[PDB]
mmCIF file with all atom_site columns, C-alpha atoms in Angstrom:
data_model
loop_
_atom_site.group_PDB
_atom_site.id
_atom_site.type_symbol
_atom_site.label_atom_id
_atom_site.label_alt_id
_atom_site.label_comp_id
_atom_site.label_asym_id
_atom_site.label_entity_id
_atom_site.label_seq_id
_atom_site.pdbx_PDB_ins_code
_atom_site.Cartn_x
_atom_site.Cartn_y
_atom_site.Cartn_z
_atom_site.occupancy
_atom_site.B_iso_or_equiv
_atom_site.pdbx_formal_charge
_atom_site.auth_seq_id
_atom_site.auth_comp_id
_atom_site.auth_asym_id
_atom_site.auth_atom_id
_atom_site.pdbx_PDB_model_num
ATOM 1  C CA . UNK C 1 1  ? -12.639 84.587  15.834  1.00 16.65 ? 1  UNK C CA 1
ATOM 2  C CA . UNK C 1 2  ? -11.300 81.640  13.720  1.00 17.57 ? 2  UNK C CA 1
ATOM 3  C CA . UNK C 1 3  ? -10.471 78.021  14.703  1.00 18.87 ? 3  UNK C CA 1
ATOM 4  C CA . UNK C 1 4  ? -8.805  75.042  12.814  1.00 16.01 ? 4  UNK C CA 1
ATOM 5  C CA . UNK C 1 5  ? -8.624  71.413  13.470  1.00 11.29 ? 5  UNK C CA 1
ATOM 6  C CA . UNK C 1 6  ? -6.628  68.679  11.106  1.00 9.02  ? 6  UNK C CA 1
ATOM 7  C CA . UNK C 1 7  ? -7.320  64.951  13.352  1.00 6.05  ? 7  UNK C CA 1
ATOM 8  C CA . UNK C 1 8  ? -6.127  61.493  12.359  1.00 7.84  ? 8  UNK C CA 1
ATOM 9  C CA . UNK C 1 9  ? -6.432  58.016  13.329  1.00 7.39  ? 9  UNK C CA 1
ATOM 10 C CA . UNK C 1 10 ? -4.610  54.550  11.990  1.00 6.69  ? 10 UNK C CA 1
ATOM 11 C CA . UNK C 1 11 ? -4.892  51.484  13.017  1.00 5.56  ? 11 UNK C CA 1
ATOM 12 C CA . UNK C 1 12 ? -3.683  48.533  11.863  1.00 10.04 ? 12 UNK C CA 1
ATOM 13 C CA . UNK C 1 13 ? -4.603  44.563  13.432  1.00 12.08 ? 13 UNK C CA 1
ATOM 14 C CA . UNK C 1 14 ? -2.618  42.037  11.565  1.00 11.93 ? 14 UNK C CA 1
ATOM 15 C CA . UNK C 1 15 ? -2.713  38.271  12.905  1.00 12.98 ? 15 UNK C CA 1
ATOM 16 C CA . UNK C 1 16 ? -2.088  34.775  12.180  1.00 11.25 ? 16 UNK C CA 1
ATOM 17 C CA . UNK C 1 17 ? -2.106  31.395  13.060  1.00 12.17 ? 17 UNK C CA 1
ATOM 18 C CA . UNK C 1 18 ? -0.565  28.161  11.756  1.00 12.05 ? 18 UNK C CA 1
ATOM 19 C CA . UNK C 1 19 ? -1.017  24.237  13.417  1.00 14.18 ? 19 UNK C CA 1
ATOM 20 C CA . UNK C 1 20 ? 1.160   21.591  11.877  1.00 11.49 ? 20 UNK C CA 1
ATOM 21 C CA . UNK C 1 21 ? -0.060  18.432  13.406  1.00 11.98 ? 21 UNK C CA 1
ATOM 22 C CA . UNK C 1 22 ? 1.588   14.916  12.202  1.00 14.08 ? 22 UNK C CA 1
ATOM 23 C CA . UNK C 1 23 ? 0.696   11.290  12.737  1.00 13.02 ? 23 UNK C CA 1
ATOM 24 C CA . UNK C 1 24 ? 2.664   8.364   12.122  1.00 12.53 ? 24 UNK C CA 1
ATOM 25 C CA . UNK C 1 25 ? 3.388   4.648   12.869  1.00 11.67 ? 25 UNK C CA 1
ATOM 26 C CA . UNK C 1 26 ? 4.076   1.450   11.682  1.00 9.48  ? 26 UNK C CA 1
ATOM 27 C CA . UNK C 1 27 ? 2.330   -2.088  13.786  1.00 8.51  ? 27 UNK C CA 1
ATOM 28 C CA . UNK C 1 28 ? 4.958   -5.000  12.595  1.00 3.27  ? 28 UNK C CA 1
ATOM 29 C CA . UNK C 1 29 ? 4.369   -9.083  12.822  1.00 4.23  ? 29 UNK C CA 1
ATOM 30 C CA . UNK C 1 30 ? 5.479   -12.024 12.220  1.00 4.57  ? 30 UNK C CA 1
ATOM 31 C CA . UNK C 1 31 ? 3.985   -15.255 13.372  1.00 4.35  ? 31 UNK C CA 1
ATOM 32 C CA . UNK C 1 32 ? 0.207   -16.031 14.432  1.00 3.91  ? 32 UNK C CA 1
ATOM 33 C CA . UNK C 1 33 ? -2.882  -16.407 12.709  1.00 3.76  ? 33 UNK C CA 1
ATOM 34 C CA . UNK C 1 34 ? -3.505  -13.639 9.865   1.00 2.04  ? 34 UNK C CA 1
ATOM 35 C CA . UNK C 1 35 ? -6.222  -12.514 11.585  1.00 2.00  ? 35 UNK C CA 1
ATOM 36 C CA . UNK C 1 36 ? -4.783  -12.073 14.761  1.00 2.00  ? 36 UNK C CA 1
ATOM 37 C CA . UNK C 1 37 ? -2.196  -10.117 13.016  1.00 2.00  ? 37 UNK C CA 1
ATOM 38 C CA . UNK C 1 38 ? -4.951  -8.060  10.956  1.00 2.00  ? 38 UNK C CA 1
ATOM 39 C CA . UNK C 1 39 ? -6.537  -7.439  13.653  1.00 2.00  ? 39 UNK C CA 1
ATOM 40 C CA . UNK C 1 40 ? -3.784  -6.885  16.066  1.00 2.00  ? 40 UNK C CA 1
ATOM 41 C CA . UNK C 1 41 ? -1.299  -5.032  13.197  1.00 2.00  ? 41 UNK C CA 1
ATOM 42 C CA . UNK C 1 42 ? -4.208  -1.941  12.712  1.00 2.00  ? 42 UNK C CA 1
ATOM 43 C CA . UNK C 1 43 ? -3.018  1.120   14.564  1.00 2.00  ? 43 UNK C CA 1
ATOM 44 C CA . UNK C 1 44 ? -6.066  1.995   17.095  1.00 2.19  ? 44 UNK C CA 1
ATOM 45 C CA . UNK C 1 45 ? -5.073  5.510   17.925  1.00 2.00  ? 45 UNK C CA 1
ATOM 46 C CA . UNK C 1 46 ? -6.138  5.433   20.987  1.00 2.00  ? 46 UNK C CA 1
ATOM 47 C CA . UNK C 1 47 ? -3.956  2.546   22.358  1.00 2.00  ? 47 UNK C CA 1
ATOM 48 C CA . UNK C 1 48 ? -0.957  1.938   19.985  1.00 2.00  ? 48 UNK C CA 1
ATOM 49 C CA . UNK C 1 49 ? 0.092   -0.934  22.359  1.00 2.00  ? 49 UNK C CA 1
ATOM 50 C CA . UNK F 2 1  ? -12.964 -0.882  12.919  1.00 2.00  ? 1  UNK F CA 1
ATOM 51 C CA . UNK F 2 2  ? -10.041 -3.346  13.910  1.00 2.00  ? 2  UNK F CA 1
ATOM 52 C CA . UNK F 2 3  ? -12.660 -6.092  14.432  1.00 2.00  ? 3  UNK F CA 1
ATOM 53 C CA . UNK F 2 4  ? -13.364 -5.988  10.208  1.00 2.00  ? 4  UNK F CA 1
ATOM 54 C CA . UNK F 2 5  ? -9.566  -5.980  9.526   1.00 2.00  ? 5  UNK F CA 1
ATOM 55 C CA . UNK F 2 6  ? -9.402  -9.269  11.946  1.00 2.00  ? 6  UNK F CA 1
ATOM 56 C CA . UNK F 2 7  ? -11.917 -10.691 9.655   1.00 2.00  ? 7  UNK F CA 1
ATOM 57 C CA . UNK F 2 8  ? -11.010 -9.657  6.576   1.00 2.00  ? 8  UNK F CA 1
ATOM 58 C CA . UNK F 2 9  ? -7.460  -11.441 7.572   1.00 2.00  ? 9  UNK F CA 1
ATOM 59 C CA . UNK F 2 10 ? -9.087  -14.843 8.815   1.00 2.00  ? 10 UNK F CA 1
ATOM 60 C CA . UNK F 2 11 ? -11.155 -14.202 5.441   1.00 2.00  ? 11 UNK F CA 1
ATOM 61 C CA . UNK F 2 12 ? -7.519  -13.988 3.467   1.00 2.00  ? 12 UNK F CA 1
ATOM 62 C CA . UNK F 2 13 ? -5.787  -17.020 4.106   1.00 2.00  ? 13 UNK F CA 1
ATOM 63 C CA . UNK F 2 14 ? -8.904  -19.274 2.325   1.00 2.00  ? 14 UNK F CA 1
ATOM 64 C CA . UNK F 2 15 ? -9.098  -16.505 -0.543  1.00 2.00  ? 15 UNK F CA 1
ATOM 65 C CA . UNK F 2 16 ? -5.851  -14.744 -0.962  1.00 2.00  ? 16 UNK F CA 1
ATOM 66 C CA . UNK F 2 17 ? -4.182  -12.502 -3.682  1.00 2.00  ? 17 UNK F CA 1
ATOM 67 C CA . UNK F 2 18 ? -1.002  -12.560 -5.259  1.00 2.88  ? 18 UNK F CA 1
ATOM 68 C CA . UNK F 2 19 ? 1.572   -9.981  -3.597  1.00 2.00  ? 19 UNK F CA 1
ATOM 69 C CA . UNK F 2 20 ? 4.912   -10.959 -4.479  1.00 2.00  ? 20 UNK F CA 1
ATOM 70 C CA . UNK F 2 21 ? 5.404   -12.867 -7.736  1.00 2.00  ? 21 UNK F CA 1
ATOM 71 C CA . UNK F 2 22 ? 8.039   -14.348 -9.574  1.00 2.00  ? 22 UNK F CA 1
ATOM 72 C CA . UNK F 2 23 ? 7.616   -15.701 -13.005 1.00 3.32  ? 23 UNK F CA 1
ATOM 73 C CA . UNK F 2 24 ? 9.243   -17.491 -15.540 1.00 3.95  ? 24 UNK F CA 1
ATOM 74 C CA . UNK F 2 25 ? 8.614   -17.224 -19.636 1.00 5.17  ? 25 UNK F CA 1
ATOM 75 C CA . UNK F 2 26 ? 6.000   -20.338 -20.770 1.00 4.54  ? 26 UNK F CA 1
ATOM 76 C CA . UNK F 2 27 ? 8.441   -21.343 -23.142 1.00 7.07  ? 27 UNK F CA 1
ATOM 77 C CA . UNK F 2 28 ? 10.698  -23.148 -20.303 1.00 2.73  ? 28 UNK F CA 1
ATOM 78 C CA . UNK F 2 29 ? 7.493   -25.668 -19.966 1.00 2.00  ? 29 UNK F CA 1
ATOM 79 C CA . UNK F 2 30 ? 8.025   -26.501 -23.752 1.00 2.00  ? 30 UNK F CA 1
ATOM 80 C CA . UNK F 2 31 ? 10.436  -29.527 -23.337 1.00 2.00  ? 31 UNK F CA 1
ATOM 81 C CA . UNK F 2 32 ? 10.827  -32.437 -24.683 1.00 2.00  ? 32 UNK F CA 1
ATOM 82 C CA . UNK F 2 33 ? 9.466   -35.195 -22.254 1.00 2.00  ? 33 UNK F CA 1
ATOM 83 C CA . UNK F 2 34 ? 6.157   -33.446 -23.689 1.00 2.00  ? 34 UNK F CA 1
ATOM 84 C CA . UNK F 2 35 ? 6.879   -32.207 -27.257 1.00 2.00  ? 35 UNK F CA 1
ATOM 85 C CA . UNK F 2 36 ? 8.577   -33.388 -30.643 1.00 2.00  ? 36 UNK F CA 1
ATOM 86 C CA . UNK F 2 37 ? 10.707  -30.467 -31.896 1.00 2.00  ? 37 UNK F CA 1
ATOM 87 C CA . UNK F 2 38 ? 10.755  -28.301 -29.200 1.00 4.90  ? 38 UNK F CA 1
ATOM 88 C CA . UNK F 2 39 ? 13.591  -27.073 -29.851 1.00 3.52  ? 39 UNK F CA 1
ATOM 89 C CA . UNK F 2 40 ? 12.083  -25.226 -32.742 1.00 2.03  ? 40 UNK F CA 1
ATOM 90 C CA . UNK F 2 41 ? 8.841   -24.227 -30.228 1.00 2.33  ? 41 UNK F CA 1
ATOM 91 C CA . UNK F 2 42 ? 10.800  -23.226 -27.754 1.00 2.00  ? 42 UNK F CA 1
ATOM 92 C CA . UNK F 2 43 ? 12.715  -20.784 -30.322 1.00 2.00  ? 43 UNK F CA 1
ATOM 93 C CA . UNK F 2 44 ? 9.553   -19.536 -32.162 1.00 2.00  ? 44 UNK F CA 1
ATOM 94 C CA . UNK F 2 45 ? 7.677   -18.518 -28.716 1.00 2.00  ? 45 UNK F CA 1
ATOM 95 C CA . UNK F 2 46 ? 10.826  -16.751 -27.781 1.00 4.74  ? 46 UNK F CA 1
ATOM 96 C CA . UNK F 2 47 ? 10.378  -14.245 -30.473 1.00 4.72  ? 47 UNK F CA 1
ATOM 97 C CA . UNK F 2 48 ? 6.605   -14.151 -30.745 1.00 3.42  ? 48 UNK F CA 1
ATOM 98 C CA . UNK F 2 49 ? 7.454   -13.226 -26.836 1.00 3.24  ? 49 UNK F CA 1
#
């Protein structure tokens, strides 16, 4: 009797992941008392209006 | 918080800076409704400028 085995394995996981996330804007006045327009002029994020 | 940027505005217009500025040399003030010669002053201060 004889026998013979020759056993493999590869594996290969490769991933990624990328996030681009961008922000911008630009509150404008003219007119009104400067700190109604300080305080209206600041971007809150949460209501741009 | 938009309520300090309101204040700091109000706060502004009684203690502002200087954003825009545009200047003249001090010679121009040496004139002679003031000062004898100043001809000769004016001249001097524009090189010693």
């Amino acid at each position: 009797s004889s026998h013979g085995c020759k056993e493999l394995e590869n594996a290969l996981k490769a991933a990624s992941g990328t996030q681009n996330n961008v922000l911008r804007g630009e509150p404008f006045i003219r007119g009104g008392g400067a700190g109604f327009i300080s305080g209206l002029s600041y971007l809150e994020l949460d209501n741009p209006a | 918080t938009a309520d300090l940027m309101q204040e700091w505005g109000d706060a502004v217009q009684y203690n502002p800076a200087i954003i825009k500025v545009k200047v003249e040399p001090l010679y121009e003030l040496v004139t002679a409704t003031d000062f004898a010669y100043s001809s000769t002053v004016r001249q001097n201060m524009k090189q010693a400028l």
